């Protein structure tokens, strides 16, 4: 019952031999400012991956 | 290097030419429609909408990035994600690049033949407006050139860029060869000056500085009409030289490889007439014409089928492409003479009457304007 | 996120495109040469009057090379003058060998660099080339580094 | 668990197929083959396993 | 030599050489869409307006194009046509004229399900059921032979055909493959020779005393490069007579363009598509030889078209036209000119009625004669 | 050093062209049938059977292997070993190679002229079906080229492969010449660097690795704009060079040998226009047409007499081979004009009447559609 209990996908070519997927992340913040300001907080991103066989 | 082909496109004007000469000329060639009551109002509405620059840009993005989309917003009293009821009406169209479209909802019902085709498109333009959704009938998607299905499915059913790595490196090394040729010309002749004990002087001191200044000064004033004096026992002054030959032929061969890999020929890619022949560049024009026409039926026509029914109230029509041949009044002057004598040199003996003879003569677009009538 | 370098290494010009400041509302008393330190002798109507550095003065900036304001080759008396108050700049020197990186420079008479053992002030930035049987160094000028003695 | 192809999946790049029969003296040999990868869990924490029931 | 038991040659290499190299793209792609877009005409039908209407309603010619493309590349392709039939998709088709779509699969997606070799039927040896495994997570569905059509590539030996389960071979055989491959090698060597035209040698006795990777050696290398960049025709360099010598060596370069042209000519010969089409360069020295070159090219493409384009037509037509007996004509694949088209229309219009006025040839057939050859002269249907 | 021709066929491309170019064009040329009441139903029935792919590969394998067979099955109520009764029925045709056919039974009757010709053919297709026996009239055998009889009866009365030893090794030598030319180009220049004591340095150790890495590094950065340093007392750096000339001419000579042995000329085997003349490749083509028709008359027609009487119920008929010449619209219209004016310019005064003038005009293939009648 494996093929009927878990989903089956076909997004993989018969010649492929390893696969990989990606993951993202972010950081940031904000403040209360005035009209004449020259500094503001910044944001960024991140990334990661995993493999298979 | 330059894996993002957009930078290459906006940097090197050559790739610009290869990517934009074909589709834009294709659309500017024009077309004509049959089965309509008339065509003057057709043209009036057409240039009233005046969307052919957007069409040009859509085709260019499809050819370059491998994909593009256009959304046609229609004046209807329904929310946009819903499908479209029958009718002939339009108020605007706008084009999105390959990066702005994703699939949202998919249908797999076996009853309809549209299973495996997206129904809902997620469009995310940006500009601090929320990404939204489009029904399939409202949008049209344009692709580039065909690619193996294994690559097609990993490119989420989208085509490939026309600037493949072979053409990229062929473009890249040509400029390198040109710079090398400039260096070859720079290094044609060299002068060598040898002085006993020249190594004795300390580094970066006044003596060495004065020696260098003297060398530069005497270099500045030498020539055919000027001479130099030296010391026989200590110093000598010699010259070495090398020849240059074949470099223009190397550059020509590299450019010819560019032409062969591109597929568009010389009098369009290097924009230089061969000059040795009078009436062969014309046949080059018809070879280019057959190439552009053949690429035309594969992509320009689907745009016409997608958009044309939304503007014309007429039921059944035909779309026929104007023959892409650069005309010449004189030549069409005898063309019109031939047509006018052929159309009625012999119809005076058959049932071919006025209301069909006039239609025949003004179907072939003449310079003769004819009011509608009997 | 990086700072670009500037191409010609001549005396009197700027060497980088880092944060710099150019005080262009000044006039000269006497004659000044490009790449020399200057001092402020007085202020009239929001304009600073500058002269070449004497003994006992506090340097304020370094004369800056321009190809429209100074057609002669140097700055002349009664001319509007450009002065660099903050940034990296090529200066004339009488030294023979490069000093330690990030040391403190000392200015002899006429606005030339002759010391590398100062207590406080401008600092050596790591550039040392040769000009005209003399050398050129690279100095990092900061705005409030030298303070006028009471 | 929660059933969705975004959390767990099983890939079948190659389907079952039969190679042509290799003949010998008076008998044949017919091989078969396929490909698989097993179960892959991209998003854990959507599965709970209660043990020792 | 040892080799895997699951033989697969035209699996990855052909696809890579197609989607990476450009000359392979051209050599496999110039033919099919030209064949399909040359156009065709039908005979035995009441009218042609509705024929073109149904054709540009169905809009299947891009599918035909890339179907023939995969047929030429992978050695095999299939197209399935869906019919408006109220039966299970395993069942055959009853006689009729109806269809709702045509869609294409590659060589990799079709296999045989069960085989019939009945003696009385001439269909022995012919796989009667095809098992197709589509992509995008769709379960396989077996098909009766009547619905789908299989298109092959080029002829091979029957010994190879049976080993390749009744499927042709790729046009990109290894001879053409490595002929394409070594061209880039020759080009790279040509560029390398161009770089290596001239060299300079600087000899300093005692240079061996220099320490490796210390300030002295770095200073020497900086000075050498610095004096190198500022040299030229208008500049001179000074050296010491006792210690150092500065010589220049040079070599000649010639014949490289001819050698590369010969390599391209070999590519043309193995390709079979001639110069002004594969290299797209007009020879330039002659006025009207490209016309005969291109008519020979149409000879090639027409003799290839008669082999593969027709079966698609004979497979699709019986499902679209209710008329019982029709024939296919191929339009003459030669581009004609407003000038000469006007001239030929004049010629045929006066030939058709210059002398028929004395015989029983009447209007009701003269009109069919004049509008049979597709004119620019329209005519409303009538007497 | 003898190799089976099938591997060479399905591996090499020039062999593919040499073996394949003639039969496919030959069969696609077409034909016309005389004595027939009408030709529309003839073509309808012909492309209903649609046997031309089988015909193509039958002729191809006859050309290659020197022998091929076709099995033609008929609507009849008898076993396959029986002869064929008079009639016109056909239901299918299939093609078998050289290796699956043998002779079974012998006839030597002096009464019939059939002595010495096999009467029963023994087919062994294999693929888990029992080999069977077929009567003579149900099978046709296609043979290759003529051979001396002392080899003919040694080869069971069968032809030989068109790829003979001279053709095979002439083809093989060309690739060797190309590889040698590539080597010649690669060995144009050589740099030699000699250092006193270099032999003292030992094999495969760290010092040797460092030295050779340094040599590779310095070689990677040499060129026109860069110089290298040398120690005068111990080491010397020289360059040796060689010239290249005549290689394209030698390759052209080898291609000459290939075309001379093949027998099909250059604009068909190399497929390259001469370029220096505009109107000589036309007579080149007509020489090709003459030779291909000469070969066609020998072997393609036997298929026509083998199969045609089995489908046509008419007692008498004839085969005419269409004039194998490319037909250009303009000249076709001109020829039609000439024919129509000749056919009735001078028949107005004699007994040449309409019922046969119509036959004459619609026999010579016109574009002139005309309904049958008086």
TrEMBL record, chains B, F:
Superkingdom of this entry's organism? Viruses
Q: What is the protein's name according to its record?
A: Portal protein
Please give the first and last residues shown and the length of the full protein: 46 to 419 of 444
UniProtKB/TrEMBL annotation, chain C:
According to UniProt, the name of this protein is IgG-domain-containing decoration protein
Instruction: Please state which portion of the whole protein this structure contains, as first and last residue out of the total length.
Output: 3 to 152 of 255
Automatic annotation (TrEMBL), chain D:
- The name this protein carries in UniProt is Major capsid protein
Annotated source species = Escherichia phage FCWL1
Automatic annotation (TrEMBL), chain E:
Report the superkingdom from the record.
Viruses
Name this protein carries in UniProt: Portal protein
Q: What is the lineage of its organism?
A: Viruses, Duplodnaviria, Heunggongvirae, Uroviricota, Caudoviricetes
């Amino acid at each position: 019952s494996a093929l009927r209990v878990f989903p089956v996908t076909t997004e993989l070519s018969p010649t492929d031999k390893t696969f990989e997927y990606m993951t993202f992340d972010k950081v940031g913040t904000a403040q209360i400012i005035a009209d004449y300001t020259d500094d503001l907080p910044l944001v960024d991103a991140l990334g990661t991956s995993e493999f298979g066989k | 290097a330059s894996y993002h082909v957009g930078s290459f496109y906006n940097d090197n004007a050559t790739a610009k030419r290869i990517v934009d000469v074909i589709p834009e000329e294709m659309v500017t060639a024009g077309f004509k429609i049959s089965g309509v009551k008339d065509e003057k109002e057709f043209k009036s509405l057409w240039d009233s909408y005046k969307i052919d620059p957007s069409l040009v840009d859509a085709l260019c993005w499809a050819r370059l990035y491998g994909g593009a989309a256009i959304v046609a917003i229609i004046n209807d009293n329904r929310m946009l994600t819903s499908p479209v009821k029958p009718g002939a009406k339009l108020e605007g169209v706008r084009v999105y690049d390959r990066f702005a479209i994703t699939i949202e909802k998919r249908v797999t019902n076996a009853r309809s033949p549209r299973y495996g085709e997206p129904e809902i498109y997620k469009v995310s333009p940006g500009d601090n407006i929320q990404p939204y959704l489009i029904h399939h009938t409202r949008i049209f998607i344009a692709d580039g050139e065909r690619v193996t299905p294994q690559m097609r499915k990993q490119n989420q059913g989208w085509g490939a860029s026309v600037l493949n790595k072979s053409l990229i490196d062929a473009i890249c090394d040509y400029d390198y060869c040109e710079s090398l040729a400039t260096q070859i010309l720079r290094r044609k002749q060299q002068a060598v000056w040898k002085v006993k004990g020249l190594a004795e002087m300390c580094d970066d001191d006044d003596a060495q500085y004065a020696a260098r200044l003297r060398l530069a000064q005497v270099d500045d004033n030498s020539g055919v009409g000027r001479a130099i004096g030296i010391d026989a026992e200590t110093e000598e002054y010699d010259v070495l030289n090398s020849d240059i030959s074949g470099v223009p032929e190397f550059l020509s061969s590299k450019m010819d490889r560019i032409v062969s890999l591109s597929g568009i020929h010389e009098i369009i890619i290097k924009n230089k007439n061969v000059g040795g022949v009078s009436a062969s560049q014309n046949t080059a024009l018809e070879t280019f014409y057959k190439l552009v026409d053949r690429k035309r039926e594969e992509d320009y026509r689907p745009l016409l089928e997608f958009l044309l029914p939304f503007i014309v109230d007429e039921q059944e029509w035909s779309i026929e492409f104007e023959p892409l041949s650069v005309p010449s009044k004189k030549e069409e002057s005898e063309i019109t003479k031939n047509n006018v004598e052929s159309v009625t040199k012999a119809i005076t003996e058959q049932i071919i009457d006025l209301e069909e003879a006039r239609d025949t003569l003004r179907s072939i677009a003449p310079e003769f304007k004819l009011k509608d009538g009997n | 996120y990086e700072n670009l370098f500037l191409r010609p290494a001549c005396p009197g010009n700027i060497s980088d495109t880092s944060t710099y400041n150019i005080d262009g509302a000044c006039v000269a008393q006497g004659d000044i040469g490009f790449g020399s330190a200057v001092q402020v002798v007085g202020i009239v109507d929001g304009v600073k009057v500058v002269a070449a550095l004497p003994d006992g003065g506090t340097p304020y900036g370094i004369a800056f090379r321009s190809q429209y304001e100074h057609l002669s080759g140097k700055i002349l008396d009664g001319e509007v003058c450009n002065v660099v108050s903050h940034g990296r700049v090529w200066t004339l020197t009488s030294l023979g060998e490069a000093p330690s990186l990030f040391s403190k420079l000392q200015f002899g008479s006429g606005g030339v660099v002759t010391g590398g053992s100062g207590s406080a002030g401008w600092t050596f930035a790591g550039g040392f080339v040769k000009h005209e049987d003399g050398y050129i160094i690279e100095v990092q000028v900061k705005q409030n580094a030298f303070i006028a003695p009471p | 668990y929660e059933k969705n192809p975004m959390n767990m999946s099983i890939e079948i790049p190659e389907a079952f197929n039969m190679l042509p029969a290799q003949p010998k003296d008076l008998h044949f040999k017919v091989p078969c083959t396929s490909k698989c990868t097993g179960l892959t869990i991209y998003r854990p924490m959507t599965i709970v396993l209660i043990t020792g029931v």
